[PDB]
Design a protein around this ligand. Structure first.
Ligand SMILES: Nc1ncnc2c1ncn2[C@@H]1O[C@H](COP(=O)(O)OP(=O)(O)OP(=O)(O)O)[C@@H](O)[C@H]1O
Ligand SMILES: Nc1ncnc2c1ncn2[C@@H]1O[C@H](COP(=O)(O)OP(=O)(O)OP(=O)(O)O)[C@@H](O)[C@H]1O
Lengths: 373, 406, 302, 592, 102
């Protein structure tokens, strides 16, 4: 809540100017795209908190149905009583005129701020072009402020709509990422020294992720680890050359063991399913690229290669078929005929080869020349 | 001063609220065609049901409200009871019946019996109105209205407009062109054909005049000296050829007469702090803030792991062409490039590379058509990436050699 | 069909004495079934011949005191909605709720925990069929039958019949498995399915029409209009899921992807939409003639 | 067509039913109750760590959301019991706000929130004494303002069968406002914590705090429940090694679950109590002494005439044979001490079997048995000293004579020094006999000679095959292997192959008389590549033309065609040939 | 009268070149379907030939939704964004007469 800008001033200024004072009209609809790092609710909330334009904030992640989305808009709006119920959209446009007739907000441009609108994209086909024309639909000095992850070009309803004014909030630049990634609040050091740490860390680290949140997380992790041998050992270059040995491994490391005990025939089932998935160009006859993935194959082929792998005391009981169904619920095998029928479809293998190697080796089986060579 | 707040208040409403400014251009013949039809359907008991088609962003609602206001100025309030519908709000029949109940002040009589045949419902609405009388039906966004389950509020309006002979205009406002071919054949063969409007734009040298008449301070006087100073500045900017250059550029992308409002709206947002009379360069940057390349803003912001990944996808078009790929071929191409390179900075290990994918899927540059190594689709152009890689500010030399290799 | 079945059972099945004796081996096995079922087990019995007459003789000799919901599984009218509906009215002696299947499932679970010694047990002919199974379908039978006060008996006929039970699904009803053989021909299945030597008529589409939501009725209005409007084009190989998704979304019939996929797979159950894979791998959709497809939505709109 | 009829207890069926059934109900109910108690004891080391972790992650709240991903086993059959125990433990030592979600009652988000707030409303309204999202937060704000605001936890049972969209949406909703409503979810991962990266994309996976826990790998769970359930002296009903072998094999190969094993033991107990009329005195020893003394005389002739006792008749002298054959009053007296000898054999068997188990588990490579289960197997399939495996132990145990052997003799002696007076009376006073050998363990030749006399006295004295060594052993032991296995694990794909290829039941049909359908399938698979319809109909017509003439042709063609089509609808119906659409006709050989 | 030729006759320049790109790709393929990147490449070629500036596909997709809103052509969604399969709602000699008459 503290710093409004941290040097993104021109977009802030043109948005602040675009709002205007209260008694005259503004835009119907403003769409803001940009990257998820780029402050797109930091900037607008610290902008809206300053002037206190009387606004409602929603997230469309929260409202999974249409009624809750209208309900919290109308219920948070009338405070600026009971739940003022709206089942439909026309109820919302009806009750909006009664709500927006109070002296706090009679002439004031009311802002209905909509966050993460890509989840609103598949709520309905009605609600997005209904929301874009609200300034003349209800005619009560409204500006619906959009912000989203996604481009407007996929967001249009393919009928056309009221095209909103579209801003691009820019990504943060490099020296701006030196400045605004916590040059304020260093607790115990000089800000020069914490800036020297993160100036060394960032220029190494500006190739994987420009997200400010996780870089703030990684910086507040690996800065006290950097900060301990200065205050214990005692010159930034030497501990720079010490901190990058830790930084490469902390980079690499941000999944206990792949081995899973199984019942014995289930092990042999998915061994057979792998072996009939990964070289299956009618090479059943021989023993008894790889990179494209798993090829589908039917059930009776799997049962034949099961009979060839296992010692021959197997009976097709109820339990081995029930086990072969229960392997799919644990998502070690997949049916790619989604509804082809109850009779044995193409079952394709979806486990990695090292896991398969471990399951094969824990019951006496070396298979890598047997699998694709 | 008085002038800056007054010019922004009086210009902003006709700018961006699309307020009723009185100058209308290019539409005089369609308006004069509409007006006598509306006068004879309104003054007399007969009912004719005109239809208007045009593109989005131009014409329709301004014309029907302007003709509405000019007809309402003539008395004998004439007891014409207008009813405004939209296609967007009233999606279903049960909403539509209660909305006509809402507009026509019906709830003095309670009417609390859902009748089966909705012709009796509509005729009861018109009947209890008739004993209490013209109505004008403004049926906006007709293309969404033509997706009823049973086309009740389409067809029963036409049946009552021919049969009840209560004064009625079913004025449909559409946006798609085939309102007839989308209309189902019993209604389209029934009474769809009253005379159909068509709506289109005009020539560019008069479109500079409609820019000037749009921008000029009106015959309403905030202060007459400031009106003369500013609309002379409007004409001086209008006669300059750079404004004409960017306006011709705006004509060939947009004939819309809505894009002009936004393009000029950003310019007037810039003006009142200092230099209240503005430049052609201020109009130029106001056009520049209306963006042209939406995707270079996305690609330009991305980190370089995503850059070498997306140029690996572009390289996946330039060998083994035209399949929806998966993760492993992308991994193979990235590994073959990084083994072509000597340095071990960028040999980033396998679970890191998935993070660039599942961030990149959120931008929808890559498409899903199994769960993590399947059939992903690229929706992109080479040349925007080729322009983006030279505009990358901290672009390293090895991904530059990857770009030149390609 | 009828003139084919006039010649049925004219003269001489080639054994009768060992068939009577082989069925007469299994009449000694019935008090074991009653005791075994009282403890909370569940008997599946499979076989090669018709065993529902054995179950009918069983319910005559030992079920004259208890309630039994004899659910046939061979004729295509029965889905589990009818099971829950008839067990709600004709067993619990009052109607239940109507909003969803899980609501009446949980409600009919809830009635039995409080009412001790109510002692109802259905039995199902032909639990595996084209209509009876399904992960929505079979699990309702499972969750229903898992209680202390409900004892199902089934018959499975298929070769792949224990393919539709995971261990968690199998743990709901304590299965134990009997072996039977009768060699009687399955006359009810072969009667009431079909015969090939002679598409779907209006009745079952009316029954699906009267048991589904009106929005699903509007969905198949769209699909049958897109089928009937391109009937004599031999290159029309069916709409995609994405095209049908958007043309369903434009008329506000459905909201989400998963709701339409669930509606598509429960209508794929009824065999009135078939999926075809083109060379893209993307599944297109075409249902099984044209003249029987105009009668409904001619008469559904007069 | 689901027509209902309205109608408008102690029946079991000599072995008289009433005390038989009460004996059944007593034994099985006791076994099930102690089964549940021994289930809940073993997981205490697991979830009492979890109470510590959840207390620590709640208490530091003054950006993150804590998850504890359990790694339970592949057995989905017994996953309810561990969650009931964990729900009990977390309900007692931490909050009375514990709910669980099942992943079958919420395909999407409205069901998720509605059932969660209903469970939360009942769980709060009991222990204080609605589709809305922020009203759940308002419920948390109203209902618990105090008691350090105890954290509501949800329990996702199956992580795997959840769809990713509804789970992602719930985690982002809950992580958005946990200022009030601190939520600590615990999803039970069925496989391994790899798949929480698979089912969750990286933004939602980065939103939280992962701390995984193990669970009880199931082999050392079933060693406890086999070891406490049947290997004890306490429960009156033992089991045969072959029936046990069937049950433990269908554990270890197919099912990997323990609730199925207890169903198998319950079935064995039930079928044993059906089977034989001498099973009624499967009791403790004074309860055996109750009505041995009064009983029907034909069951006492059955106690004379069962073959283990007739082996005892064969080994004994005539002067008591003539009165002990028929007369009940002496037959009671000899059978009573025979039942006492049965209990005696069990009591000196099992504790020295555990002693041998501890003495054999100490060994390098453990060649006899891996665990306590298989030691029962190796001392009953073959004769144990006849077999080469105890020969390998005896060959091993000589030069293993160092202080590892002396130290583990002391250690095994300490664990059955706890079982010294937990035996509390031995059938040879073998506790202080062997302890009188085992008391010189504190004071390198002596370990060898003491070893020799200990295993010789031990194994040659009691450790023997229980049927032939003991008459009247049928009362405790139940043995019918492939009678049971087909009840518990049947194979229809073998049954149809058998009754279709060889439908010989008892007149001449073994390698043309009395099928119709096996004629159809056998003639289908005499042309064993594929088939078209009309020639197959002609071939069936040919072989029943042979059947007709081994007992006009147009009526015969009609009746042959009708019985052909009745056969061929079943051969389509039973998982064989699938109809070949759009051609003239054919059938497709779908099963080889 | 027919609406469509008057709609083409009062269309803008980039719309007319988009219809020219549509007919150029339909002369190349012969089919009634085309993807958006193909006609985008044709549109890039025609804006190169006419001395126009570069047709960015934000503008080209805005004009594609313009022409799809007015039903001179039949569209796929803007979600597919490069993979839009477009059909032409009017016949080809009609639009040839519409861009041939002047
Ligand atoms: N200029 C800035 N100065 C300081 N902190 C910032 C700045 N921009 C962003 N942040 C950080 O970003 C957080 C807000 O995230 P942001 O505004 O990027 O969300 P968002 O863009 O709405 O996310 P999404 O696009 O995924 O919906 C704040 O908590 C703050 O820590
Ligand atoms: N001939 C004209 N005279 C005056 N203003 C015009 C004219 N043509 C277009 N406009 C302007 O273009 C916009 C047209 O908006 P209107 O709602 O009336 O039509 P529309 O936007 O095409 O209809 P819809 O809202 O259904 O798309 C308004 O800003 C209007 O001021």
């Amino acid at each position: 809540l503290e710093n409004v800008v941290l040097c993104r001033e021109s977009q802030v200024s043109i948005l602040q100017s675009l709002f205007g004072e209260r008694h005259h009209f503004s835009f119907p609809s403003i769409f803001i795209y940009g990257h998820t790092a780029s402050g797109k609710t930091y900037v607008t909330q610290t902008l809206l908190k300053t002037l206190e334009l009387p606004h409602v904030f929603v997230n469309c992640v929260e409202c999974f149905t249409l009624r809750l989305l209208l309900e919290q808009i109308l219920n948070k709006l009338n405070h600026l009583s009971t739940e003022i119920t709206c089942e439909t959209f026309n109820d919302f446009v009806r009750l909006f005129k009664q709500v927006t007739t109070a002296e706090n907000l009679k002439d004031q441009t009311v802002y209905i701020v909509l966050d993460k609108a890509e989840y609103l994209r598949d709520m309905e086909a009605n609600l997005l072009p209904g929301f874009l024309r609200l300034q003349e639909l209800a005619d009560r000095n409204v500006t619906v402020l959009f912000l989203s992850e996604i481009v407007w070009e996929k967001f249009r309803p393919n009928t056309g709509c009221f095209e909103p004014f579209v801003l691009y909030f820019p990504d943060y630049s490099i020296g701006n990422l030196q400045k605004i990634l916590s040059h304020d609040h260093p607790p115990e050091y000089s800000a020069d020294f914490y800036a020297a740490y993160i100036n060394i860390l960032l220029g190494v680290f500006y190739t994987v992720c420009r997200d400010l949140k996780e870089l703030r997380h990684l910086a507040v992790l690996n800065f006290p680890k950097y900060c301990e041998p200065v205050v214990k050992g005692e010159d930034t270059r030497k501990l720079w050359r010490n901190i990058e040995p830790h930084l490469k491994k902390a980079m690499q490391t941000v999944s206990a063991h792949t081995h899973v005990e199984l019942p014995y025939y289930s092990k042999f089932i998915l061994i057979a399913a792998y072996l009939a998935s990964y070289n299956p160009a009618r090479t059943d006859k021989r023993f008894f690229n790889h990179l494209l993935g798993p090829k589908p194959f039917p059930l009776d082929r799997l049962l034949a290669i099961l009979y060839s792998i296992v010692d021959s005391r197997v009976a097709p009981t109820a339990n081995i078929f029930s086990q072969i169904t229960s392997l799919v619920t644990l998502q070690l095998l997949t049916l790619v005929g989604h509804d082809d029928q109850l009779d044995g479809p193409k079952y394709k293998c979806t486990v990695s080869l090292d896991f398969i190697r471990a399951i094969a080796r824990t019951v006496n089986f070396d298979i890598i020349k047997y699998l694709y060579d | 001063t008085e002038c800056l707040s007054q010019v922004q208040r009086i210009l902003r409403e006709r700018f961006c609220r699309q307020s009723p400014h009185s100058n209308l251009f290019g539409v005089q013949v369609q308006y004069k065609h509409l007006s006598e039809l509306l006068k004879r359907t309104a003054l007399h008991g007969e009912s004719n049901s005109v239809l208007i088609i045009g593109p989005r962003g131009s014409g329709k609602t301004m014309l029907i409200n302007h003709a509405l206001k000019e007809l309402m100025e003539i008395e004998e309030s004439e007891n014409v009871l207008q009813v405004h519908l939209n296609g967007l709000l009233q999606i279903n029949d049960k909403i539509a019946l209660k909305e006509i109940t809402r507009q026509l002040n019906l709830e003095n009589v309670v009417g609390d019996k859902v009748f089966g045949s909705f012709a009796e419902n509509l005729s009861f609405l018109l009947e209890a109105l008739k004993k209490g009388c013209p109505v004008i039906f403004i049926l906006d966004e007709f293309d969404l209205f033509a997706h009823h389950k049973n086309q009740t509020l389409l067809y029963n309006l036409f049946d009552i407009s021919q049969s009840a002979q209560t004064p009625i205009a079913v004025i449909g406002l559409t946006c798609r062109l085939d309102i007839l071919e989308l209309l189902e054949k019993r209604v389209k063969s029934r009474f769809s054909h009253r005379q159909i409007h068509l709506m289109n734009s005009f020539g560019f040298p008069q479109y500079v005049k409609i820019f000037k008449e749009q921008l000029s301070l009106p015959a309403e006087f905030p202060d007459k000296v400031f009106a003369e100073k500013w609309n002379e500045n409007v004409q001086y900017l209008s006669e300059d050829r750079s404004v004409q250059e960017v306006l011709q550029k705006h004509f060939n992308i947009s004939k819309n007469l809505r894009s002009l409002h936004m393009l000029l709206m950003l310019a007037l947002n810039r003006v009142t702090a200092s230099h209240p009379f503005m430049t052609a360069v201020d109009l130029m940057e106001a056009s520049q803030l209306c963006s042209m390349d939406s995707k270079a803003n996305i690609v330009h912001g991305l980190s370089v792991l995503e850059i070498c990944l997306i140029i690996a996808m572009k390289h996946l078009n330039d060998i083994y062409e035209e399949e929806p790929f998966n993760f492993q071929m992308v991994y193979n191409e990235f590994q073959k490039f990084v083994q072509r390179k000597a340095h071990s900075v960028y040999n980033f290990e396998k679970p890191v590379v998935m993070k660039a994918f599942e961030h990149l899927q959120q931008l929808e540059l890559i498409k899903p058509m199994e769960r993590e190594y399947q059939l992903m689709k690229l929706l992109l152009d080479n040349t925007q990436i080729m322009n983006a890689l030279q505009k990358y500010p901290n672009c390293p030399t090895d991904v530059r050699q990857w770009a030149t290799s390609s | 069909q009828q003139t084919l079945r006039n010649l049925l059972s004219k003269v001489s099945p080639s054994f009768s004495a060992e068939l009577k004796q082989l069925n007469q081996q299994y009449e000694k096995l019935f008090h074991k079934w009653m005791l075994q079922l009282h403890l909370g087990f569940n008997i599946v019995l499979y076989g090669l011949g018709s065993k529902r007459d054995l179950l009918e003789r069983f319910r005559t000799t030992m079920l004259q005191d208890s309630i039994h919901v004899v659910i046939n599984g061979f004729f295509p009218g029965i889905s589990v909605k009818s099971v829950l509906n008839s067990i709600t009215e004709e067993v619990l002696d009052h109607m239940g709720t109507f909003r969803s299947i899980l609501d009446q499932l949980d409600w009919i679970v809830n009635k039995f925990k409080e009412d001790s010694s109510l002692e109802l047990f259905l039995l199902i002919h032909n639990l595996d069929s084209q209509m009876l199974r399904g992960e929505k379908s079979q699990q309702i039978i499972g969750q229903l039958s898992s209680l202390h006060n409900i004892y199902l008996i089934a018959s499975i006929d298929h070769l792949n019949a224990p393919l539709m039970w995971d261990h968690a699904k199998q743990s709901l009803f304590n299965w134990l498995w009997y072996e039977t053989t009768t060699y009687s021909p399955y006359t009810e299945e072969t009667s009431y399915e079909n015969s090939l030597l002679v598409s779907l008529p209006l009745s079952s589409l009316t029954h699906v029409l009267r048991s589904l939501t009106p929005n699903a009725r509007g969905i198949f209005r769209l699909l049958i209009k897109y089928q009937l409007d391109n009937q004599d084009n031999p290159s029309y190989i069916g709409l995609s899921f994405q095209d049908f998704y958007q043309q369903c979304r434009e008329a506000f019939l459905v909201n989400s992807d998963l709701t339409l996929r669930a509606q598509l797979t429960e209508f794929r159950d009824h065999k009135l939409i078939r999926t075809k894979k083109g060379t893209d791998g993307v599944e297109y959709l075409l249902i099984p003639d044209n003249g029987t497809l105009t009668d409904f939505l001619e008469k559904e709109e007069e | 067509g689901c027509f209902v009829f309205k109608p408008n207890e102690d029946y079991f069926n000599p072995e008289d039913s009433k005390l038989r059934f009460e004996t059944y109900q007593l034994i099985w109910q006791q076994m099930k109750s102690e089964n549940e108690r021994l289930q809940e004891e073993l997981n205490k080391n697991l979830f009492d760590n979890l109470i510590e972790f959840l207390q620590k992650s709640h208490s530091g709240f003054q950006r993150e959301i804590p998850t504890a991903a359990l790694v339970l086993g592949v057995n989905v059959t017994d996953h309810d019991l561990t969650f009931g125990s964990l729900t009990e433990a977390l309900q007692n030592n931490v909050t009375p706000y514990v709910v669980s979600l099942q992943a079958k009652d919420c395909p999407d988000m409205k069901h998720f929130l509605q059932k969660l707030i209903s469970q939360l409303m009942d769980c709060c309204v009991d222990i204080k004494s609605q589709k809305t999202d922020p009203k759940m937060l308002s419920k948390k704000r109203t209902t618990s303002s105090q008691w350090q605001s105890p954290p509501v936890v949800v329990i996702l049972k199956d992580m795997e069968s959840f769809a990713t969209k509804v789970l992602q949406d719930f985690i982002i909703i809950s992580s958005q406002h946990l200022h009030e409503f601190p939520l600590i979810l615990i999803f039970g991962i069925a496989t391994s914590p790899i798949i929480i990266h698979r089912l969750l994309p990286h933004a939602v996976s980065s939103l939280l705090c992962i701390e995984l826990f193990q669970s009880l790998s199931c082999k050392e769970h079933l060693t406890t429940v086999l070891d406490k359930l049947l290997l004890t002296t306490q429960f009156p009903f033992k089991i045969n090694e072959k029936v046990l072998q069937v049950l433990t094999n269908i554990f270890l190969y197919h099912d990997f679950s323990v609730q199925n094993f207890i169903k198998g033991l319950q079935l064995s107990l039930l079928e044993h109590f059906y089977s034989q009329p001498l099973s009624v005195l499967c009791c403790n020893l004074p309860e055996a002494k109750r009505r041995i003394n009064f009983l029907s005389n034909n069951q006492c002739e059955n106690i004379r005439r069962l073959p283990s006792f007739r082996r005892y008749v064969e080994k004994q002298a005539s002067e008591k044979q003539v009165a002990l054959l028929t007369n009940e009053r002496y037959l009671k007296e000899e059978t009573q001490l025979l039942l006492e000898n049965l209990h005696v054999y069990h009591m000196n068997y099992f504790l020295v079997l555990r002693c041998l188990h501890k003495f054999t588990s100490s060994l390098p490579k453990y060649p006899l048995g891996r665990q306590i289960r298989e030691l029962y197997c190796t001392c009953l399939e073959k004769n144990i000293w006849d077999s080469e495996e105890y020969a390998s132990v005896l060959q091993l145990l000589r030069m293993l004579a160092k202080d590892e052997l002396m130290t583990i003799l002391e250690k095994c002696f300490k664990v059955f020094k706890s079982y010294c007076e937990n035996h509390l009376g031995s059938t040879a006073k073998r506790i202080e006999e062997f302890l009188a050998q085992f008391q010189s363990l504190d004071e390198k030749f002596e370990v060898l000679r003491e070893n020799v006399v200990n295993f010789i006295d031990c194994l040659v004295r009691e450790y023997l095959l229980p049927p032939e060594t003991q008459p009247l052993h049928e009362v405790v032991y139940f043995s019918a292997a492939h009678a049971l296995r087909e009840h518990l694990n049947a194979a229809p794909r073998i049954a149809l192959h058998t009754a279709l290829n060889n439908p010989y039941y008892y007149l001449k049909n073994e390698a043309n008389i009395a099928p119709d359908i096996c004629i159809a399938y056998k003639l289908h698979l005499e042309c064993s590549r594929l088939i078209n319809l009309v020639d197959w109909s002609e071939a069936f017509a040919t072989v029943v033309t042979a059947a007709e003439k081994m007992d006009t042709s147009e009526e015969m063609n009609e009746i042959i065609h009708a019985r052909f089509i009745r056969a061929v609808s079943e051969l389509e119906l039973l998982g064989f040939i699938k109809p070949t659409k759009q051609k003239t006709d054919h059938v497709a050989r779908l099963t080889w | 009268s027919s609406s469509y030729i008057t709609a083409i006759k009062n269309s803008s320049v980039l719309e007319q070149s988009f219809l020219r790109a549509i007919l150029a790709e339909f002369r190349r393929s012969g089919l009634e379907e085309a993807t958006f990147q193909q006609i985008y490449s044709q549109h890039v070629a025609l804006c190169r030939m006419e001395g126009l500036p570069y047709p960015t596909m934000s503008e080209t997709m805005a004009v594609c939704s313009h022409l799809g809103s007015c039903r001179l052509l039949l569209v796929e969604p803007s979600r597919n964004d490069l993979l839009l399969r477009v059909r032409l709602n009017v016949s080809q000699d009609d639009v040839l007469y519409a861009l041939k008459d002047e």
